[PDB]
Amino acid sequence: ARIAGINIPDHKHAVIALTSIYGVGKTRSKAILAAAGIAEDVKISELSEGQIDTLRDEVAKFVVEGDLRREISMSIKRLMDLGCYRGLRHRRGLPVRGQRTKTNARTRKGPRK
Amino acid sequence: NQYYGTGRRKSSAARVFIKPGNGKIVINQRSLEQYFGRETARMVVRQPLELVDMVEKLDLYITVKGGGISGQAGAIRHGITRALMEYDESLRSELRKAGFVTRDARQVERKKVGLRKARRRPQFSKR
Amino acid sequence: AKQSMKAREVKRVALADKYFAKRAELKAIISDVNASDEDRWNAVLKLQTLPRDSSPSRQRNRCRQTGRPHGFLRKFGLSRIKVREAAMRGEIPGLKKASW
Amino acid sequence: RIRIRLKAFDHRLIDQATAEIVETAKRTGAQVRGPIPLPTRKERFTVLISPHVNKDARDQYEIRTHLRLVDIVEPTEKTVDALMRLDLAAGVDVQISL
Amino acid sequence: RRRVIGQRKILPDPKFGSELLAKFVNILMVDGKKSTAESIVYSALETLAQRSGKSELEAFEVALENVRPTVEVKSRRVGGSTYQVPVEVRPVRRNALAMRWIVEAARKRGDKSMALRLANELSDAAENKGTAVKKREDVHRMAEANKAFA
RNA sequence: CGGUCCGGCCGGGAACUCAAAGGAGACUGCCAGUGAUAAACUGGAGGAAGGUGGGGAUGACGUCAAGUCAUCAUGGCCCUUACGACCAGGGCUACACACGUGCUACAAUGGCGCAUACAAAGAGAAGCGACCUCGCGAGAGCAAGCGGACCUCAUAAAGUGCGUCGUAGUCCGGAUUGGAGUCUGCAACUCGACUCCAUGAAGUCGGAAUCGCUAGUAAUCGUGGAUCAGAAUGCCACGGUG
RNA sequence: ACUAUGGUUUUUAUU
Known part of the structure; x- marks a missing residue:
């Protein structure tokens, strides 16, 4: 139990603790289920050491675990100047993509008093 | 003798033959319960058939095409009564007693102008 | 509409027959990325924007008895206030409120 | 190889023009395909009618066409020529193809 | 005799043992999606017989005998006055209201x-306990505090 | 009714439909009763249908301190070295706060997975573009079929069957957040539509009150079309369930 | 004679 899923429900479906975690969602969860060739319907296969933990290499070509944000957390510091539209909108909590502020902005502005 | 009846309802059209003989029912060259089994109108065609008792002395042969199941079933029910009232003209008095010899009060009318489906009432809140 | 618009009308269409209506089947086939080293068309795409006031998006279909780009029916060339008379004066083939 | 179509904007005008060519079809071949009735086409329009807004005031129109195929059924230069003194009727359109 | 009665409208089921069925499965039913309201026939009472005691032959018969409306109180016209009166719950409604x-x-x-x-609301109703029963005796006494003319 | 290891398929035939057109039947006509043997109301035979059969065309006199110089006409007022008209860039999603009408929902009258039934009305002259293929994918490549009751847009959904969720802001839900694309147009900072893999917060049926229907009626599911370079959830048609 | 149940019609303007 918990050989890849980090949560205590160990008798349930192959999405539980195996999606939206450390750079893995449905599409990349399928890609390591495919790497080990195992079964997924109703429950994930009961498995031992040296069977799928050895195959994390077959899904490694993405930002994962300790590397999920590491280098972008330095690259995103590159623009900070107040005259730069991207610099200012990194230096303050603002959308670099641009949005409307007058009407239907209440998620970004948060709750009103 | 072969007693004939036509029936039609909402883009569907059916033909019925009634004969004296062995108590059988055939539809589109299939059994009555060969392809129907979950459809909400599949029993309404039986309504006039118990009035003379079922599947003991009368032969039924039905053909149908067009429309959907609630249309086909209503077309077939009236096609059955139009054939059954030829088989015995004293059944006319009994088919009136259950409403089965009249075209029902639901039929397709032409699209009322604009206004989406043109049947709903639009906004009239006073705000 | 401006009084200049009926002079602009015949100037726009003459520029479109000179250029746009004679280039439309060429502009669709210069989208090539197969030539070996450098591009062969990159310097001539600017012909889409070279004449002034003439372009297919400015040159809308327009109403043909009134000076409007908007509120029209293409199969007649008319607006509702001219269709209400033309449907009573036809002329326009088959146009009637039934009754044959 | 050739194809013919006859279209009219009135349900009596389609007969007036078909009557030239269903009788031409009796001066050729040995069996005729009649008018070949085809489905009628209905073009509709829903419009506004008030001088200003009034969303409860709306109006509608329809333009319907009747189409006959006939089929010329045999290669004869005299039978295709029957279409050359026919399209001039007010509300008729003849379309020859191939 | 031609136009007489007219009979049927609905027919009695040999297995359900109640004529309320044609108004009982009309509850929590939206946009004509009947099978999502008929989902309680041979399922909910099979579970009640596994959550409170044993058997289901009289549970729905006795729950609606314990929760039984008999009177309703309205402001009603005699002209021009509109006196409050108790009125008996109409015979076709009398056992068909409480289940909704x-x-x-x-x-x-x-x-x-x-x-x-x-499977939980019926084990309270089968003792006249729980939901809406305090309001039922409140109507019963709303008709006791004034009996009008009869 | 021939050919029929037995198909509207080929010959044939329009019975039955459909596309339609030209045209019917119903007059209070016939009976009971109430009521004033009038009218009308409630019942009934005959009929497919009757006492608004279902549905839809309407502005009698008069009225409102009603709208419109903007359908169209045109007085006056004002500018007339200009508020006229030409020319290029700009503005019309510039932001603060309260909404009127909508919408995905708040979970199980629901989702997730997987298979699966029953359609009409339209669009199609560098069109609609199949089969197949590349690309994670938007989209694009290669080229049939048909100029279109036939081909192509075009795998209807809700529903139905078998598993699953254990009622919790959740396997729910998805504003966000990141890196790069696909498509269009002088133009996408501001101010467009679409996509891939990650990534993430609210929402717990709505305060006084306000609005819809007497039945194919309130409610609800899916497909087209116009304007049009790219862009609608509004507009106009159509079919399914109850 | 009995829905138990809502105060009272602003200073006052003058195309």
Whole structure:
């Protein structure tokens, strides 16, 4: 139990603790289920050491675990100047993509008093 | 003798033959319960058939095409009564007693102008 | 509409027959990325924007008895206030409120 | 190889023009395909009618066409020529193809 | 005799043992989606016989004998005055109302929906306990504090 | 009714439909009763249908301190070295706060997975573009079929069957957040539509009150079309369930 | 004679 899923429900479906975690969602969860060739319907296969933990290499070509944000957390510091539209909108909590502020902005502005 | 009846309802059209003989029912060259089994109108065609008792002395042969199941079933029910009232003209008095010899009060009318489906009432809140 | 618009009308269409209506089947086939080293068309795409006031998006279909780009029916060339008379004066083939 | 179509904007005008060519079809071949009735086409329009807004005031129109195929059924230069003194009727359109 | 009665409208079921069925499965039914309201026949009472005691032959018969409306109180015209009067609950309604009136706890009990809700509200109703029963005796006394003319 | 290891398929035939057109039947006509043997109301035979059979065309006199110089006409007022008209860039999603009408929902009258039934009305002259293929994918490549009751847009959904969720802001839900694309147009900072893999917060049926229907009626599911370079959830048609 | 149940019609302007 918990050989890849980090949560205590160990008798349930192959999405539980195996999606939206450390750079893995449905599409990349399928890609390591495919790497080990195992079964997924109703429950994930009961498995031992040296069977799928050895195959994390077959899904490694993405930002994962300790590397999920590491280098972008330095690259995103590159623009900070107040005259730069991207610099200012990194230096303050603002959308670099641009949005409307007058009407239907209440998620970004948060709750009103 | 072969007693004939036509029936039609909402883009569907059916033909019925009634004969004296062995108590059988055939539809589109299939059994009555060969392809129907979950459809909400599949029993309404039986309504006039118990009035003379079922599947003991009368032969039924039905053909149908067009429309959907609630249309086909209503077309077939009236096609059955139009054939059954030829088989015995004293059944006319009994088919009136259950409403089965009249075209029902639901039929397709032409699209009322604009206004989406043109049947709903639009906004009239006073705000 | 401006009084200049009926002079602009015949100037726009003459520029479109000179250029746009004679280039439309060429502009669709210069989208090539197969030539070996450098591009062969990159310097001539600017012909889409070279004449002034003439372009297919400015040159809308327009109403043909009134000076409007908007509120029209293409199969007649008319607006509702001219269709209400033309449907009573036809002329326009088959146009009637039934009754044959 | 050739194809013919006859279209009219009135349900009596389609007969007036078909009557030239269903009788031409009796001066050729040995069996005729009649008018070949085809489905009628209905073009509709829903419009506004008030001088200003009034969303409860709306109006509608329809333009319907009747189409006959006939089929010329045999290669004869005299039978295709029957279409050359026919399209001039007010509300008729003849379309020859191939 | 031609136009007489007219008979049927609905027919009695040999297995359900109640004529309320044609108005009982009309409850929590939206946009004509009947099978999502008929989901409680041979399921919810099969679960009630596994959540409160044994058998289901009289549970729905006795619950609606314990929760029984008999009177209703309205402001009614004699002209021009509009006196409050008690009126008896009409015979075709008398046992068909209470089965639709258990709603003021449905979003609060956490009973895990439909057939599992029904398997809990009936074990209170079969003692005249729980939801809406204090309001039933409040109407019974609303008609005791004034009996009008009869 | 021939050919029929037995298909509207080929010959044939329009019975039955459909596309339609030209045209019917119903007059209070016939009976009971109430009521004033009038009218009308409630019942009934005959008929497919009757006492608004279902549905839709309407502005009698008069009225409102009603709208419109903007359908169209045109007085006056004002500018007339200009508020006229030409020319290029700009503005019309510039932001603060309260909404009127909508919408995905708040979970199980629901989702997730997987298979699966029953359609009409339209669009199609560098069109609609199949089969197949590349690309994670938007989209694009290669080229049939048909100029279109036939081909192509075009795998209807809700529903139905078998598993699953254990009622919790959740396997729910998805504003966000990141890196790069696909498509269009002088133009996408501001101010467009679409996509891939990650990534993430609210929402717990709505305060006084306000609005819809007497039945194919309130409610609800899916497909087209116009304007049009790219862009609608509004507009106009159509079919399914109850 | 009995829905138990809502105060009272602003200073006052003058195309």
